[PDB]
Design a protein around this nucleic acid. Structure first.
Ligand SMILES: [Ca+2]
Ligand SMILES: [Ca+2]
Ligand code: NA
Ligand code: NA
Length: 276
DNA sequence: TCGACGGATCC
DNA sequence: GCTGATGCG
DNA sequence: GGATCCGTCGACCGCATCAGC
């Protein structure tokens, strides 16, 4: 069935007004996504911070439209070393972070340009593009190594500062998070080992699934739909893109949005409002 | 993801 | 320049 | 023993890149 994301709640439980708008988007080809007017959508959405995953673009090839973003002038990029046109993530912020780092401090997992870490006054932001386990699950084993090291790294981060984690985490946690769970138990993104890995992550850091925390009973809410078989217009999708929050930020949480109508990728953007 | 295809399985 | 592949999602 | 059900295959879209000429 179809899904309508409800209006933006821009007030916290405490009645405090949202001060921080973070948008996260798996763009699936930075250059293509801009040709399909993704930065126009971004300007209308006007986030303080924009996290992009799967840029598929080296730094020397960053398109010039990026220099047309006066509200997002601090930009940080990470691409793989060995593979061209693979992975890649970006983080663009209105204000300069205090510190910016790359990867998770484990060199087995820091080759593919998948993680940026941006520290602010009140919180640390991680945007992540999590390794897909691949058709035939040819990478599932590597991805369980990833989940383990990433979990550990995130736990250490949250132990010093409130943590926001956003991006394409390449798992539908529960049956409610995809349209066809029964048919997908052996496919990338809904294996038992990926679902446990995400459950372990929520329990160990610990972190809350912001969307879930606010809409526990809401099915049909997805962020990815295959380009094939007209899946998007049928809403045959998966919720793969999350904002995961340190529990201390839940009093600051105003809303966690799924921007179902924003085209340009086989993922849609998600948007977090916080009262900081 | 979805159809076609077989080969179980169920009133 | 153009076609059609491949790796990957 | 008619209908339904369940695993197994393949084609399927799009981006960026490369092979070949
Ligand atoms: Ca007979
Ligand atoms: Ca020739
Ligand atoms: Na790979
Ligand atoms: Na019969």
């Amino acid at each position: 069935a179809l899904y309508e994301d409800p209006p933006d709640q821009k007030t916290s439980p405490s009645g405090k007004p949202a001060t921080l708008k973070i948008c996260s988007w798996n763009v699936d080809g930075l250059r293509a996504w801009i040709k399909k007017k993704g930065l126009d959508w971004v300007k209308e959405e006007a986030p303080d911070i924009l996290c992009l995953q799967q840029t598929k673009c080296s730094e020397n090839k960053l398109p010039a439209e990026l220099q047309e973003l006066p509200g997002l002038s601090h930009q940080y990029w990470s691409a793989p070393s060995d593979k061209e046109g693979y992975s890649g993530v970006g983080l663009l912020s209105r204000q300069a972070p205090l510190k910016v780092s790359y990867g998770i401090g484990d060199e087995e997992h820091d080759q593919e340009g998948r993680v940026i870490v941006a520290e602010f006054d009140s919180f640390v932001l991680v945007t992540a593009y999590v390794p897909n386990a691949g058709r035939g699950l040819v990478r599932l084993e590597y991805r369980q190594r990833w989940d383990e090291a990433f979990r550990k790294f995130l736990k250490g981060l949250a132990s010093r500062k409130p943590l926001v984690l956003c991006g394409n985490l390449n798992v539908a946690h529960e049956e409610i998070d995809l349209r066809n769970p029964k048919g997908n138990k052996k496919n990338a993104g809904f294996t038992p080992q990926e679902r446990q890995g995400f459950g372990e992550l929520l329990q160990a850091v610990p972190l809350a699934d912001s969307f879930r925390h606010l809409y526990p009973n809401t099915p049909y809410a997805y962020t990815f739909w295959t380009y094939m078989m007209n899946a998007r217009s049928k809403n045959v999708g998966w919720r793969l893109d999350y904002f995961l929050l340190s529990h201390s930020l839940l009093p600051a949480l105003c809303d966690s949005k799924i921007r179902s109508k924003a085209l340009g990728s086989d993922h849609c953007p998600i948007t977090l409002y916080l009262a900081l």
